[PDB]
Amino acid sequence: MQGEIIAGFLAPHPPHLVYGENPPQNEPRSQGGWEVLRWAYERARERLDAMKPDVLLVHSPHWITSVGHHFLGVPELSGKSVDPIFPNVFRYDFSLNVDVELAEACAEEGRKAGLVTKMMRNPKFRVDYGTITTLHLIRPQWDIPVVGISANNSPYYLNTKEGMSEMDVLGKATREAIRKTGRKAVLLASNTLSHWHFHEEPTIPEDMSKEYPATMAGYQWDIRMIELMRQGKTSEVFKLLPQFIDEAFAEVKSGAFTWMHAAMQYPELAAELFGYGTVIGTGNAVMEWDLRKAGLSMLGAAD
């Protein structure tokens, strides 16, 4: 048995993308919307469909923890996820399955590496709206076990550098958990890029004639970062990540993007851009690092 990281996805969680799809789980109904980003996710969906992984691991900015890094530790979780900011677009009934064994492995290896880690064992816990949105976007069937990871406070409470350093440690902790368990895993970094936004609610939100970048410079930052990734210049994206954080208010400050690449060992590998679009002005890219195609997917002999 060998553990494997099949691929890593930049899988952002803007809820408007599920709103525009009108799945059965979502209560409110739209007249469509954001189909560029949505078509980008159909490309992502079919790539994941072919992977047939054992587990999806996701790192969400909207489960914020102060005391270390937390992992969903209950086998079955469910609920009604209502978005606090866009309740008119996202009220989603969900029911998911947690890969508790791997989640515990991750927590274990994280602790061993010097992070403080916790298992979430309250079965009435409501999984965060960011996690539910990304999972639906990449996998609407809800047929793959998940490992939900919290985004520890460190990047904001301490500083970007120290927080990123924790996220790096978390990532290599995750890789080690995956490889010891022998799981065939896909990674999901639930981060949008530039997060400058519209401050106003636009009556009929699906109106794509009123959807565009909030700023020029923020869009310019997104393109520059997106180009480097598809160029395979991974060390250059991470060297630029802090300045990108500050000037573009990028959601990767939350840590998912660093956690993912740390788990993949920062591969100098060309990423595929399924698509880029804006939602309320914020830049969102749906992308993939196919480690299996690069031959970098296999981690080592499991225990």
Binding site: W63, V67, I85, R91, V116, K118, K124, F125, E201
Partner: protein
């Protein structure tokens, strides 16, 4: 119009595990604040919680009855928070309308399963508010709003209450110093994270006891920065705005730790 004013913690730890003595003292203090609230006979409770977060427009809770079971995303290990929260829809809806006339775009939020924050929930439970007798008008903590704007929302809401002939109890929900421990501790050994946070808490708590609004006002921004105060202490600004920058003094019914952070229950003497 305002008959009562209180500041209470947003932490659920006093509710969830009162058998930790200092946590239990804080819960007992909140309970007492609720009794004082009731004795002032308000028709509505004007609530602001630091954990009720908005980023687009100002939100005002407009659902007549919101009921559920909430599990705090940090303190889930300590139990569940059942709630049955009533809103004064007529008054909340008037605040939504009045807000743009005071330069703040606002909406109501009336959705089944809308995530009411931990602070609002624990305050309701311990203080016995958000009932049919003491329904709530909850205004959001918009992350882009300053203290000055928060004061404007509070006064704006008090005026709407005066128009509807309703006595108002004002409740600000949030912590003091915010240096939460970043490792797991024994709850029985909980204490204020550091001495500097403790001194800052005690210093400002005494300014509030004395009713020294002038000195309090100039201390607040420095305090908020240096002691990492919950959300810039805007929950106090909420009280100040409702009181129109004037109160005679205060009674600190409790001051204690909450996983390294600071917390207090304060009864205000108008």
């Amino acid at each position: 119009t305002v008959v009562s004013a209180f500041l209470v913690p947003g932490t659920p730890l006093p509710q969830l595990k009162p058998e930790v003595p200092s946590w239990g003292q804080l819960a007992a203090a909140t309970e007492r604040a609720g009794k004082a609230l009731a004795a002032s006979r308000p028709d509505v409770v004007l609530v602001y919680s630091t954990q009720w977060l908005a980023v687009l427009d100002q939100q005002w809770l407009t659902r007549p009855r919101s009921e559920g079971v909430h599990v705090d995303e940090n303190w889930y290990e300590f139990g569940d928070l059942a709630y049955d929260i009533r809103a004064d829809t007529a008054l909340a809806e008037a605040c939504v309308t009045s807000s743009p006339l005071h330069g703040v775009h606002a909406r109501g939020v009336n959705y089944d399963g809308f995530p009411i924050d931990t602070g609002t929930i624990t305050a309701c439970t311990l203080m016995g508010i958000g009932t049919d007798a003491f329904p709530l008008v909850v205004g959001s903590n918009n992350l882009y709003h300053s203290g000055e704007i928060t004061e404007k929302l509070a006064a704006l809401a008090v005026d709407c209450a005066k128009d509807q002939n309703k006595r108002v109890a004002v409740v600000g929900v949030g912590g003091l110093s915010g240096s939460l421990f970043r490792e797991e501790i024994d709850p029985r050994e909980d204490r204020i994270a550091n001495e500097e946070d403790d001194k800052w808490n005690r210093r400002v708590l005494k300014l509030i006891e004395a009713g020294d609004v002038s000195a309090l006002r100039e201390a607040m921004p420095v305090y908020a920065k240096e002691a990492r105060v919950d959300m810039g202490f805007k929950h106090l600004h909420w009280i100040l705005g409702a009181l129109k920058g004037k109160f005679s003094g205060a009674n600190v019914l409790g001051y204690g730790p909450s996983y390294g952070s600071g917390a207090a229950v304060i009864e205000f003497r108008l």
